[PDB]
Design a protein around this nucleic acid. Sequence first.
RNA 1: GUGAUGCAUGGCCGUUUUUAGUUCGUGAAUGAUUUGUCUGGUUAAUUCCGAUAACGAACGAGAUCUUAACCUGCUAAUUAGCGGCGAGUACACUGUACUUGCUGCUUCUUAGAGGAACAUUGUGUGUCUAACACAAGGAAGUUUAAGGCAACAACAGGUCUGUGAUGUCCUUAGAUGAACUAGGCUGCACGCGUGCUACACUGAUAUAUAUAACGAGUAAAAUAUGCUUGCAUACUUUUCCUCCGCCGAAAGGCGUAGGUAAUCUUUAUCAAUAUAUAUCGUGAUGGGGAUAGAUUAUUGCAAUUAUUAAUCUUGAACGAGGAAUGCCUAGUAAGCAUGAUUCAUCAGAUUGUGCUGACUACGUCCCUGCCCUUUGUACACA
Lengths: 154, 138, 157, 48, 98, 180, 41
Amino acid sequence: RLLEPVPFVKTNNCIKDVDADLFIRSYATHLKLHNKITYPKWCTFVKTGKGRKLAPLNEDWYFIRASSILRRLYLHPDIGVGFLRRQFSSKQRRGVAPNHTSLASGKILRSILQQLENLGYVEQNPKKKGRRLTTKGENAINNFARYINKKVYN
Amino acid sequence: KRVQTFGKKKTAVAVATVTNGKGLIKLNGKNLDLVEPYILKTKVYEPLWLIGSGKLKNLDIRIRVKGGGQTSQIYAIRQAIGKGIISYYQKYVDESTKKELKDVLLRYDRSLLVGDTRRCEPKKFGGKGARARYQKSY
Amino acid sequence: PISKKRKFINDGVFQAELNEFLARILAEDGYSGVEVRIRELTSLVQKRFFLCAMAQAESLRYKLLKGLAVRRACYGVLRHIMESGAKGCEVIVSGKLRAQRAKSMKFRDGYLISTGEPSKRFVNTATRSAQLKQGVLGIKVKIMLPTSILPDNISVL
Amino acid sequence: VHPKKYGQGSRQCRVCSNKHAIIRKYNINICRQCFRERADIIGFKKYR
Amino acid sequence: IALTSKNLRAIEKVCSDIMKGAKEKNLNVSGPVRLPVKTLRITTRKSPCGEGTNTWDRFELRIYKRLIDLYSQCEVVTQMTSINIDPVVEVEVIITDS
Amino acid sequence: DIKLFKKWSYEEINIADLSLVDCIAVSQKACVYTPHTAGRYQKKRFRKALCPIVERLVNSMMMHGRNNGKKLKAIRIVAYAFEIIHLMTGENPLQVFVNAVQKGGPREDSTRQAVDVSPLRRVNQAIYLICTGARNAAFRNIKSISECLAEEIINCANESSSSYAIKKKDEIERVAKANR
Amino acid sequence: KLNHAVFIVITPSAIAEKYKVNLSVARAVINHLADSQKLYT
RNA sequence: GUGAUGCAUGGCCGUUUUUAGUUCGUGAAUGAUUUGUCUGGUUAAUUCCGAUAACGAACGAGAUCUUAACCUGCUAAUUAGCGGCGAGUACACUGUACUUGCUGCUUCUUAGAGGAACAUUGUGUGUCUAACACAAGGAAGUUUAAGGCAACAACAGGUCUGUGAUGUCCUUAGAUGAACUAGGCUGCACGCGUGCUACACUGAUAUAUAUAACGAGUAAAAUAUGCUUGCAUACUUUUCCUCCGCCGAAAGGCGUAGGUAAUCUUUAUCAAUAUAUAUCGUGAUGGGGAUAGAUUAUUGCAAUUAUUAAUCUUGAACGAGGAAUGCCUAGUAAGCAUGAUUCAUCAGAUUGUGCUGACUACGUCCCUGCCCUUUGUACACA
Ligand SMILES: [Mg+2]
Ligand SMILES: [Mg+2]
Ligand SMILES: [Mg+2]
Ligand SMILES: [Mg+2]
Ligand SMILES: [Mg+2]
Ligand SMILES: [Mg+2]
Ligand SMILES: [Mg+2]
Ligand SMILES: [Mg+2]
Ligand SMILES: [Zn+2]
């Protein structure tokens, strides 16, 4: 599907050398297999952000979100909740008044982050700013990426 | 050894650091495998295809992009690559080869070497856009 | 503590205020100045804080107040300007002026460039509103100074 | 006396005490017409 | 040392003068770095009234901040600063080791 | 090797009009791999002649306000159409497109009396007509745009008055005839 | 009008045309055969 | 005096007009006047050439100014980077991705001074005059693109509701002054504006992915003491941008952190169109979000005639729009957002900024509007 004749070699080492959506999906699947992260209470009847005016329709969207968050963390040095919210923003059609940008429902994100920290994937750094990845977690992510790459090659 | 040039489309400066290496070619921290949309991918790969994939096994490339939207960014990247490879050739490889490469690029199209000079013209009062005025009913 | 932008604007405002104050005070003076009997002025400023066009305009206003034949006064002013070495001048006086309705009166001598950044540079302009019998007479004086060279000329040796 | 602290009638032009059309950016607090006249002295030049 | 001002050419001249002063002796002077000119733009609507096809006018008070460094004693720097100067260019000296 | 869409090479293509060749340049420097060129095609009178035909088609497709300035989408649609052409009604899609273009231009038009049409103008009209027809087919149907467009193209190639553009052209011709 | 049904050279449009069906059903059929625009043979 | 009068005026602004127009010196042709300032060619231009009772000026145009366009691989290096290099964490081959700690280059980042296009070279058309068209070169060939500036003369155009610019007349304690309490500017059989949102499948829906530029950001409250919710006394963060950490479905809240700003908000990314993968499936449909109903907040002394915001639900008109009419020629139209202005709160406005990037001219006087010469006029309030 993705593969093609390219004019260079790809150092498939870290997650930045992997296609995103597929990777996310894979991570979600892995999570599901594990049963490493829960699905709180309110998750199953909440709306992800003001602009969505409708539920997710993905069943295991939470897992996907978590995966995305991990990737984001890997990408940036130190990333807050506000930043995360901003990242997962969309257009809110206000019916008749024109669209505005809409900040995501941060609570769910926060919960996810908390869960991750409990599990030992993210790390609230006392120096600098809000919650980056923890080294072990990063390593795990890298491994997963590598695995994905291998699969794709196969 | 190592050569730094830029591309430029709209605002969107892609700075291509072209170094001695094995032939990987990257964007900020990501392979050119990604870029973003599958459709536009060819606009980045095209100079490489023109020059040949074997010629770039001596040359590593990193590209830092900043500013602009998507298509513009891609264009900038392309431009950087075009300027970059040629610049490298002019210095550390021969002149004849460089000339050949330039000729090839010219035959394909402009924009690879020379830049797109267009930029967003200031909006003017009495309207929303540059030229587009409002509306009179009489 | 106040930011740079904020500071600059404030300074500008202060300058303007000072200028206005000077204008209010010195109806009897050839005023231009703005660089810091006068004791009182100094005190006032402290309390607050914690050839030329303007002068000519002022003179004109004074003359008007005194009560001259207007045209004659204007002519005199023009002559004075000429003497003071001006390449060109222009005075306007619009308002009531003798008749009830309307009546703007131009008084040019030498040539007066109007358009371009040269105009902005090489003319001093000034505007006073002399209150009189049954309203206001409206001075505007415009002087073209000696150039540091005009963009139109191409002086071959 | 009634709260005159936050509203259009709270503050005014520095210059002529007008409550309408005050340039309130950078704490200039001059009603725009007045500003237009004193834009030279304040150091606001029209370029573009 | 930070030199904040409104008038470009004057500022430039001042900078040049200070450079010259430095070049005398004893001063490891970093070159003048002009900062991002944060332009105060006011877009006022011309015309007191509401008559006429509402023309605006973009004023721009464009402040030039200029910056320059040194490794020196206070008195010497003060002396250097004394080029006479005038009300137009706003000077500030920072005498910090850090 | 030089190619388009990494698939249809246009070294195999043919033309057989002369005038149309002169007008539309699918050449050595008007080679292209994906339509999206940021070319300066409207800074001169005849610089639109250098423009590749695929690009033109894409531009045409791009029309109608709420879909305006969505180049990528248009490109995708055209790619899909090409694929369809390749698969069902098996032929080099470029050739088909060329044929359609050849078909499409009304050779004589009316005015305030009958006059002839320049080749470039005719080509432009054809481009417009094909896209407009496709759009019409799409609008409040179901079918899908790419499929409809493909169908239209095929019809044009055939030279058959089931599609809209061809019909329009015919009408124009008739009008011209009537005039003179 | 054309109320298409649900209970009973490959593309969805073609399928819709042929057996008179919703295009979700067409998609489903395609998927079954295999076992955001489509092309199949 | 936000009383009356812009037909008493000032200044300022609009239009005539961003078009090319206005004027003088002398000369010439009872007077108003004309000429100059023109048959023609040319120009974006009374821009030039050429003809000539004119010759020569001046303002206007042009130049100038400000940006944006490409270079100096000269000037400079923070509050910008690039490397340099330690320190690691992952994986490759015999380097790549990512953070903490320390400190030659200036390509990118900032911004000062310079440079570069003059139709240069080439070839056409042109009185082979002014000049135009094409080609090459080139960053660029419509004064390179965009503005800004704005002559003369007006309009009985607007504004005394911007002004303590300002005349007269009115009003002056049962004030048309100021101050306070509500209420109204938003009231609605209807007509005409400017917009926004739509009418779907190039689409909604929902996940995921991508990526901007201009910006803009500092009298009231907290805690303790002394007395009768109030005052007094003492003392210190908060008044704007919000990082971040927690609570909250959501809005928001509480705690704290940086920032008087290339440092922090935040900007090697603050946006949406984008794109990719799913759910729909042409059915007023999940298109559409009007109208309504009921809460939870925030702003404020005060929210009802609902400030705005959120949550649930309500599911109206509209299947591309008649007579008419607007805007537009290249980073433009359109789409998409977004910063700022108002701001205690509130963009559907304006004003900037970007992002996705079409079609069609490359002309003409057919309409419309201006301008010119001739011509006619009983009009000159034209
Ligand atoms: Mg001039
Ligand atoms: Mg009037
Ligand atoms: Mg005359
Ligand atoms: Mg000019
Ligand atoms: Mg009202
Ligand atoms: Mg408004
Ligand atoms: Mg019209
Ligand atoms: Mg008469
Ligand atoms: Zn005022």
